[PDB]
Design a protein around this ligand. Structure first.
Ligand SMILES: [Cu+2]
Ligand SMILES: [Cu+2]
Ligand SMILES: [Cu+2]
Ligand SMILES: [Cu+2]
Ligand SMILES: [O]
Length: 488
């Protein structure tokens, strides 16, 4: 039995009425021979790739065929709050909502997913995610690999776990509210360890970490380099050669990799230094997909220069906004203890010696109900407040750079922090200047026991009724309060 081929999402463009139709629905998938209920856009699992063009408007008709409410957020796309599809963007079960997207940002790979209040983790875990391919005038002149599904492929990497009966085994509980929902099965565009046949020359991979909570670190099995050409918000100024590529939850990178005749190799993910994430099989490099070379010449180029990145402006005089992330200490400690009890020392493999200590310290954490004050559902916070959909925390300026300072000092958990309505520039990532491939346009920044600072500008309105979100993209943290709303 050979490896299945890598599924290729349909690249979906507008009709004559300038409409794209997305249906959200429940179906079935098979994983290792067992059927599971799964959810998808225009299918059973995952979704299509919606193709957009800078300066053109399209209308998307969104049909919710689930039996529960949902929303549809365009992660990475700079659009008004009204069409942003945050938690206020409710689509009733059996109903339809239409949005018009007036695309005005550079070429990039973005994505889309649910943003249902308190339930985003579950709805993503059930299968909802799709892709957005934005093109502009500039990018096509570069003559990059561009044959969709051949030498230009999306690679959506996600973990899941399943119960004995085959169903997706998702829970938002005290453990997952602390450390995230993660599993033992890695999916690549919904398939387990697929192969992709690619022509000789350059192969472009549009990588998305679509995991709820698991950070990833891409590399190749034979140590051939990856050439990073794009981050969340578009092209870098020039390619950046790397041996390994860390990718946080919700982040995208586009890379070129060389394909040579007769030498198959795997894309792999390397063990990460994140609590819970190095349990077998993830204690060792884990294959993501095999690349099978085809002896046909691939036409794409790796240009010396890709785009022009503007200089960072002067910081003096810019509004500063503080966003202090926090976790309830008691519930954080409880969740961590549950993780250690379940998996043992391995749940801290690869962490620092200071943190590591899982020594004599398994004291009795109580199991009685002490009321809503101690409910994990609102344990995670920004500026001392669990997300309140009725109360945006502030109004940001429109068309002005601001400096946002996001702190995770006070706990050791990983918080990939995401801000709607913008592509920003990272000034400091967790207390260090950003790596070259992370110095361009980003919509996510790492916050882990330290402080990050980003330079952000909002070009579109967001009223109180359809506010922008800023949140941790570890989805179980978001769902248990680590989110705020803001207006523009
Ligand atoms: Cu997102
Ligand atoms: Cu977003
Ligand atoms: Cu977090
Ligand atoms: Cu969001
Ligand atoms: O998001």
């Amino acid at each position: 039995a050979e490896r299945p081929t890598l599924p290729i999402p349909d690249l979906l463009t507008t009709d004559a009425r300038n409409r794209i139709q997305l249906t959200i629905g429940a179906g079935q998938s098979t994983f290792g021979g067992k059927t599971a209920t799964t959810w998808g856009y225009n299918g059973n699992l995952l979704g299509p790739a919606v193709k957009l063009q800078r300066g053109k408007a399209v209308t998307v008709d969104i049909y919710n065929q689930l039996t529960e409410e949902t929303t549809l957020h365009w992660h990475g796309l700079e659009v008004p709050g009204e069409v942003d599809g945050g938690p206020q963007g409710i689509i009733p079960p059996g109903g339809k909502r239409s949005v018009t997207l007036n695309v005005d940002q550079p070429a990039a790979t973005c994505w889309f997913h649910p943003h249902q209040h308190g339930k985003t983790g579950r709805q993503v875990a059930m299968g909802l995610a799709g892709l957005v391919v934005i093109e502009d005038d500039e990018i096509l002149k570069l003559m990059l690999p561009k044959q969709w599904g051949i030498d230009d492929v999306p690679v959506i990497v996600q973990d899941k776990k399943f119960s004995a009966d085959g169903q997706i085994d998702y829970q938002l509980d005290v453990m997952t509210a602390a450390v995230g929902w993660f599993g033992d099965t890695l999916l690549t565009n919904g398939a387990i360890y697929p192969q992709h046949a690619a022509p000789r020359g350059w192969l472009r991979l549009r990588l998305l970490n679509g995991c709820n909570a698991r950070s990833l670190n891409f590399a190749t099995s034979d140590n051939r380099p990856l050439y990073v050409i794009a981050s969340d918000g578009g092209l870098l100024p020039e390619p950046v050669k790397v041996s390994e590529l860390p990718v946080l939850m919700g982040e995208r990178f586009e890379v070129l990799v060389e394909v040579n005749d007769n030498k198959p190799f795997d894309l792999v993910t390397l063990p990460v230094s994140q609590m819970g994430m190095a349990i077998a099989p993830f204690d060792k490099p884990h294959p993501v997909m095999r690349i099978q070379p085809i002896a046909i010449s691939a036409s794409g180029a790796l240009p010396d220069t890709l785009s022009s990145l503007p200089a960072l402006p002067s910081l003096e005089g810019l509004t500063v906004r503080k966003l202090q992330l926090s976790m309830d200490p008691m519930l954080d400690m409880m969740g961590m203890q549950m993780l250690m009890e379940k998996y043992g020392d391995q749940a801290m493999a690869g962490m620092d010696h200071s943190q590591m200590m899982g020594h004599m310290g398994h004291g009795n954490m109580n199991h009685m109900n002490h009321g809503g004050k101690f409910d994990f559902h609102h344990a995670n916070k920004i500026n001392g407040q669990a997300f309140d959909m009725n109360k945006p925390m502030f109004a940001a300026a429109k068309g002005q750079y601001e400096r946002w300072v996001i702190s995770g000092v006070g706990d050791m958990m990983l918080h990939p922090f995401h801000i709607h309505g913008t592509q920003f520039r990272i000034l400091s990532e967790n207390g260090k200047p950003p790596a070259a491939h992370r110095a361009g346009w980003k919509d996510t920044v790492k916050v882990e026991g330290n402080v990050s600072e980003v330079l952000v500008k909002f070009n579109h309105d967001a009223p109180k009724e359809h506010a922008y979100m800023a949140h941790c993209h570890l989805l179980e943290h978001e769902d248990t309060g680590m989110m705020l709303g803001f207006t523009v």
